[PDB]
Amino acid sequence: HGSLVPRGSEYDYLFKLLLIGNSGVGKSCLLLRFSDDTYTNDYISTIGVDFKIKTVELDGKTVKLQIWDTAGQERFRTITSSYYRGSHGIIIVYDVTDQESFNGVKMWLQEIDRYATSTVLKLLVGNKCDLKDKRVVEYDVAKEFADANKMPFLETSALDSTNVEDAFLTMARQIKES
Ligand SMILES: Nc1nc2c(ncn2[C@@H]2O[C@H](COP(=O)(O)OP(=O)(O)NP(=O)(O)O)[C@@H](O)[C@H]2O)c(=O)[nH]1
Ligand SMILES: [Mg+2]
Numbered sequence: 001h002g003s004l005v006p007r008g009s010e011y012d013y014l015f016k017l018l019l020i021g022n023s024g025v026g027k028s029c030l031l032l033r034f035s036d037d038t039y040t041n042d043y044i045s046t047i048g049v050d051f052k053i054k055t056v057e058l059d060g061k062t063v064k065l066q067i068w069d070t071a072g073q074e075r076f077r078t079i080t081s082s083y084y085r086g087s088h089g090i091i092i093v094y095d096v097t098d099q100e101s102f103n104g105v106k107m108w109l110q111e112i113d114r115y116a117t118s119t120v121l122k123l124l125v126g127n128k129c130d131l132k133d134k135r136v137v138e139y140d141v142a143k144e145f146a147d148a149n150k151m152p153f154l155e156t157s158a159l160d161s162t163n164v165e166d167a168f169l170t171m172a173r174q175i176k177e178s
Contacts, residue, residue, distance in 0.1 A: 013063045015175045017168070018083060020108050021093035022101040023072030026127035029158035030093065031069050034168050039158060046071050048078035056169065058176055065172055084115035088175045089123065091167065094142075096126040096155060097134040102142065109149065121174040122151040125167050130157035 019027040028046050032038050035052045046069055054065045068087070071077045084090070092108045094101040105124065112120060124146045126137060139155060146153035152170055156163040 013061070015063060015065050015172060016086060016088045017065055017067040017171055017175075018087040018090045019067065019069050019093060020079075020090060020111070021072060021125075022095070022098070022104045025072065025093045025095040025098065025101050026156075026158045027072065027093050028069055030125070030127060030156060030164060030167070031067055033158040033161060033164045035067070037161075045073050045076060047076045049083065054168070056172060058169070058172060063172060063176065065168065067168070081115040084112060084120075085117060087116065087120060088178075089121035089171045090116060091123045091125055091171055093125045093127055094137070095128050096137045096142075097128050097131045099136045102126070102137045105145070121171060121178065122149070123167065123171045123174070124149075124151055124153040126153070126155045128157060128159070129155040129162055130159045 019031060021027050023045055024043060029039055031052055032040070035054045049068055049070050051066055051068045054067060056063055056065060068083065070079055090112055092105055094105050112122065124142065126142050143153055154163050154167045154170060156167050158164060
């Protein structure tokens with residue numbers, strides 16, 4: 001007794017997102033910007049895997065985003081095949097001022113191709129677009145790469161908020177439209 005509150009399962013409209021990319025590209029700062037609207041100049045390298053839950057509204061419906069942050073440093077990784085296979089969508093992050101991080105994208109895509117399902121949603125993010133001064137990866141170059149791999153592409157800055165919400169909502173929409 002007494003009043004029924006109609007409820008569904010714990011995992012109803014819970015979308016699982018995975019952030020992958022080289023160390024230093026800004027995966028953790030992107031997540032912190034999106035979830036807390038906060039930022040740090042500090043480079044505190046992520047150990048293993050961790051998640052945050054961000055609740056958003058899409059087309060008048062509330063969906064929970066379970067976003068997994070990952071170690072970019074190999075010596076700190078715990079990520080296992082199931083993390084790829086258990087994700088609805090994967091965001092690959094590079095740093096537009098770091099050619100090596102962008103070269104690493106092909107290898108990250110091959111990790112997804114190895115361990116994720118053929119149908120996993122993908123999004124390419126070139127971070128640190130606030131560093132216009134230090135850009136080494138041209139938009140048109142990354143865009144052509146993304147196009148050839150049939151995935152959307154956004155440039156972002158965790159520092160000044162540019163496209164951050166858009167990146168995560170883009171992926172959320174990709175999963176919801178699925
Ligand atoms: N200018 C600028 N710096 C950024 C941006 N995003 C992150 N950084 C900086 O770049 C460094 C690395 O950020 P971090 O979020 O830790 O990257 P990460 O990919 O999570 N690293 P790891 O894989 O090792 O955990 C930090 O010094 C951070 O302040 C951005 O958009 N612009
Ligand atoms: Mg990190």
